[PDB]
């Protein structure tokens, strides 16, 4: 029940199936060619489609190994469908029945796969009809025959080791009294200053309508230092004057609960 690879479930086909089969039946893991002058009596374990099964998935966080400071990769749950036929070079005791019966007694006996336990498998499921098998028998050169299919779901792992995080060492918390004014009360007082510093009016408020003033502040007097970040759009005319306004507005004797303006005056607005 560790994390597997598609070769590790393909090698577990041969060790499962050759313990029940005869000793002199060759096992080829590819569907043979059309002419195929070959050794007689091959059992062709063909892997026709592999896809991840949505039914078995779940909500998994990447696990944390502590002794290395590393995050675990994770799994995909890929399902591998097989197709087991019997090829050659007229009785109730057929030759092709005796080999397919030896395969069938190996498939239903290994409901959980013995070389790889914990893999969720479906043995010989009713997946077929005559219409679906009609398109399959046409594919391998118009030769109808018996076919057993058997599907294993094994987890495949991703590959990374660079995603690393340190374990949590110390938890420290520091409760504090928040001031009476907030970020919202300050942002009205800065813009209504900037409307008034420009000269007020309605025609000056609409050109400054798409500019917000957001403050990150540290109140250090306890009887306060506030700095902002400016972003938006404004017209070509008042770009020069407003950039002249908050130029002088920072470096002053802090005369404007006081508004003590300091270094960061971040600009994201480009005037149009």
């Amino acid at each position: 029940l560790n994390t597997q690879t598609i070769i590790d479930v393909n090698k577990a086909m041969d060790a499962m199936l050759r313990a029940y089969l005869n000793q002199d039946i060759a096992i080829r893991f590819d569907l043979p060619e059309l002419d195929t002058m070959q050794s007689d009596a091959m059992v062709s374990i063909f892997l026709y489609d592999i896809h991840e099964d949505l039914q078995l998935r779940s909500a998994e966080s990447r696990g944390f190994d502590v002794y290395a400071g590393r995050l675990l990769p994770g799994w995909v749950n890929i399902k591998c469908n097989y197709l087991i036929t019997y090829w050659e070079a007229s009785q109730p005791d057929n030759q092709a029945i005796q080999v397919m019966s030896q395969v069938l007694n190996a498939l239903i006996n290994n409901r959980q796969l013995a070389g790889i336990p914990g893999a969720y498998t479906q043995v010989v499921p009713p997946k077929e009809s005559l219409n679906s098998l009609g398109n399959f028998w046409q594919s391998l050169g118009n030769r109808p025959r018996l076919s057993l299919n058997y599907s294993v779901t094994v987890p495949v792992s991703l590959n990374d080791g660079q995603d690393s995080a340190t374990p949590v060492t110390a938890v420290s918390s520091t409760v504090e009294q928040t001031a009476s004014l907030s970020q919202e009360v300050v942002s009205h007082a800065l813009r209504e200053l900037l409307i008034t510093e420009l000269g007020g009016g309605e025609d000056n408020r609409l050109v400054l309508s798409k500019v917000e003033l957001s403050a990150v502040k540290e109140t250090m007097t306890q009887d306060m230092i506030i700095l902002l970040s400016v972003s938006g759009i404004t017209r070509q005319e008042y770009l020069k004057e407003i950039d002249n306004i908050f130029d002088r507005w920072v470096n002053n004797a802090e005369v404007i609960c006081g508004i003590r303006i300091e270094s960061i005056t971040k600009d994201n607005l480009v005037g149009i």
Binding site: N2, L56, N77, R111, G118, Y120
Partner: protein, 140 residues
């Protein structure tokens, strides 16, 4: 370790003391009612109240000459019916262990439905029976 969930086709149902082959077992849910008391001040109280009743409807194929389910429900006179425990438990496919086990204590059958005979089908005769019991707990 990935530890895939176990499929539902392997389980054992043992009614009373004898094990019998059931085609399907449904329901068997622990349930509770909720009680709300909205305050005038504004806070909310959500508590789980009385235990809701437990209802189990489990099927069975009709077997030739074996009457287990009828001789249970035939013994119902006015309210005196024998009650017997039901243990539904999932296994691993070797058949030895029990991975997760439900037991249903003091079950008595209310109703059983005879198989719906439809002579335009090739299906198999299956008969439900609807137990009703209390105190379903899960073991490990």
């Amino acid at each position: 370790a990935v530890e895939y969930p176990i499929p539902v086709y392997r389980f054992i149902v043992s009614v009373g003391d004898e094990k019998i082959p059931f085609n399907s077992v449904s329901g068997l849910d622990i349930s509770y009612d909720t009680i709300e008391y909205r305050d005038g001040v504004g806070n909310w109280f959500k508590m789980p109240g009385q235990s809701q009743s437990t209802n189990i409807t489990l099927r069975k194929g009709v077997f030739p000459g074996k009457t287990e389910l009828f001789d249970w429900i035939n013994s119902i006179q006015l309210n005196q019916v024998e009650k017997k425990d039901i243990t539904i438990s999932l296994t691993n496919d070797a058949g030895t262990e029990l991975l997760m086990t439900w037991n249903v204590s003091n079950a008595f059958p209310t109703s059983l439905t005879s198989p719906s005979f439809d002579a335009t089908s090739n299906d198999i005769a299956v008969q439900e029976i609807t137990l009703m019991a209390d105190r379903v707990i899960m073991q490990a």
